[PDB]
From a paper:
MHC class I complexes are formed between human leukocyte antigen (HLA) proteins, β2-microglobulin, and a peptide, typically 8–10 amino acids in length, derived from an intracellular protein. Peptide binding is mediated by two anchoring residues, the second (P2) and C-terminal amino acids of the peptide, which bind in pockets “B” and “F”, respectively, and anchor the rest of the peptide.
Interestingly, electron density for two distinct conformations of the phenylalanine residue at P5 were observed. In one conformation, the phenylalanine side chain sticks out of the binding cleft, exposed for antibody binding, whereas the other conformation orients the side chain laterally, similar to the serine side chain in the WT structure. Both conformations should be accessible to binding, and a single final bound conformation may be stabilized by antibody binding. We predicted the structure of E10 and then docked it to our mutant pHLA-A3 crystal structure.
Author numbering:
A (entry chain B): 20 to 119
B (entry chain A): 0 to 278
C (entry chain C): 1 to 9
The structure:
C-alpha cells in the first residue's frame, strides 16, 4: 500500500586509517516494505562473509538494517554499498567516501 | 536522564503461496539488543544477544521460545483476518508490526507502558497511556478494538506492562549493570569541504555516543538554519555506539558566522562548535 | 520477558 525508499549510508565504525583493520557499514533505513537486498562491494565486486542486524523499525513503522564486514582501508581499494528495493528503478550504489 | 526501557519488536510478512510468513522478533534494553527470534534461523529458539542475559536458565529459554512462537502463530492468523477487513486479495505480501514495552526511572519506578500495532506500515491500533483503553486508526481496526474490549485484553496486558515488564526490566538492569548503566557522551568535531572557490560544506560530527538520542542544530549568528541543514539519520557504529552528522553549505570567508549545537544526556553543557579560520 | 499473547484481531 505505502512504499518508502531506503535512505542509504556508507561508513566505517572507526575513522579510517590506511593499513589498520576496521568495519565497513551500510545502514539502510526509512524503507517499506521490508524486502530489500544489500551488498557491500570492493572494487565493484560483491564481498561474501557480510553480516547484518536483525530487522527492526522506527516510530513511523519504517524498517532499518545494518550490513557490515571487517576490512582494511588502502588508498587503492574502492568500497561501495549496493541496495535493491521495490521503490528503486535500478539497484542504487552508494560509494564509501573517506569523510564518513 | 537516568531512565531505562524494555521493548520488544515483532514483524510478520506474509508470503503468498510460498509457506509460512517471515517472522522476526527482537528485544532491547534501552538501545542494546538482548534477545532475537528469526523464523528462518537454524535454532528455531529465542536466542541471547547480550552476555548478561546468557546467564538465564533453560526454563527461561523454553518459556521465551514457546511465547514468541505463539506470538508468530497469532500474527499469522491476524494477517488473514486483516486481509479480510481491508478487502484485499490472497496474492499480495502484507506486513504486521507490533511494538510494546515499559519505561522506569533511575529509582526503578514504572513511568510508562505502551503497545502499538501496525498493518502495511500504517497505524492499526494502539493502547492508550492509561493502559485501560484502545485507539483504532480506522474503521477496520475498530473491529479488533471491539474483540479486545470484549475479552478485556487491556486489563491482562496492563498487569504485564506496569507489573511483570517493570520487575524483569529492573532485573536485567541489575544483571547487566556493567553494560547498561554506561552513558557515553559524543566525541564531536567539525570538517570543511570546499564545493567551489566561493562555497564550502561545514559538517558537524557526533561520534561514539550512547544512548542513540541526540540533537544537532546549525545556527548562523544565533539564528537557526532548519531549512539549509542536511541531517542524516542517527546510525549504529556496530560496537554498541551511535553516530550522526549535520551539514550546512556556507560562503567561503563566512565560516566563523556558523555554530553547531550538540545536545546529549552524557554532555554536562550543550557543546558549541565554531569553524575558526587563521589568526 | 515477552508479554502473554493477546487473542486474535
Amino acid at each position: 500500500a505505502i512504499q518508502r525508499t531506503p535512505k542509504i549510508q556508507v561508513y566505517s565504525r572507526h575513522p579510517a586509517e590506511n593499513g589498520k583493520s576496521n568495519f565497513l557499514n551500510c545502514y539502510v533505513s526509512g524503507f517499506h516494505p521490508s524486502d530489500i537486498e544489500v551488498d557491500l562491494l570492493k572494487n565493484g565486486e560483491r564481498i561474501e562473509k557480510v553480516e547484518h542486524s536483525d530487522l527492526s523499525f522506527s516510530k513511523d513503522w519504517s524498517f532499518y538494517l545494518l550490513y557490515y564486514t571487517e576490512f582494511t582501508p588502502t588508498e587503492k581499494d574502492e568500497y561501495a554499498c549496493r541496495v535493491n528495493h521495490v521503490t528503486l528503478s535500478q539497484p542504487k550504489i552508494v560509494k564509501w567516501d573517506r569523510d564518513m | 536522564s537516568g531512565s531505562h526501557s524494555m521493548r520488544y519488536f515483532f514483524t510478520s510478512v506474509s508470503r503468498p503461496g510460498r509457506g509460512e510468513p517471515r517472522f522476526i522478533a527482537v528485544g532491547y534494553v534501552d538501545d542494546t539488543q538482548f534477545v532475537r527470534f528469526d523464523s528462518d534461523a537454524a535454532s528455531q529458539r529465542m536466542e541471547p544477544r547480550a552476555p548478561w542475559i546468557e546467564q538465564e536458565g533453560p526454563e527461561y529459554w523454553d518459556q521465551e521460545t514457546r511465547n514468541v512462537k505463539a506470538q508468530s502463530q497469532t500474527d499469522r492468523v491476524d494477517l488473514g483476518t486483516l486481509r479480510g477487513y481491508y478487502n484485499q486479495s490472497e496474492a499480495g505480501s502484507h506486513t504486521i508490526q507490533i511494538m510494546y514495552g515499559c519505561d522506569v526511572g533511575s529509582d526503578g519506578r514504572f513511568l510508562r507502558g505502551y503497545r502499538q500495532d501496525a498493518y502495511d506500515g500504517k497505524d492499526y491500533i494502539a493502547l492508550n497511556e492509561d493502559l485501560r483503553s484502545w485507539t483504532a486508526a480506522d474503521m477496520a481496526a475498530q473491529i479488533t478494538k471491539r474483540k479486545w474490549e470484549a475479552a478485556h485484553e487491556a486489563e491482562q496486558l496492563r498487569a504485564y506492562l506496569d507489573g511483570t515488564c517493570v520487575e524483569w526490566l529492573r532485573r536485567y538492569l541489575e544483571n547487566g549493570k556493567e553494560t547498561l548503566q554506561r552513558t557515553d557522551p559524543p566525541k564531536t568535531h567539525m570538517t570543511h569541504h570546499p564545493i567551489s572557490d566561493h562555497e564550502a560544506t561545514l559538517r558537524c560530527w557526533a561520534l561514539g555516543f550512547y544512548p542513540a538520542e541526540i540533537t544537532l542544530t546549525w545556527q548562523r549568528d544565533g539564528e537557526d538554519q532548519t531549512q539549509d541543514t542536511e541531517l542524516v539519520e542517527t546510525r549504529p557504529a556496530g560496537d554498541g555506539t551511535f553516530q550522526k552528522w549535520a551539514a550546512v553549505v556556507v560562503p567561503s570567508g563566512e565560516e566563523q558566522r556558523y555554530t553547531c549545537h550538540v545536545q546529549h544526556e552524557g554532555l554536562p553543557k550543550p557543546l558549541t562548535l565554531r569553524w575558526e579560520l587563521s589568526s | 520477558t515477552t508479554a502473554p499473547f493477546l487473542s486474535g484481531k
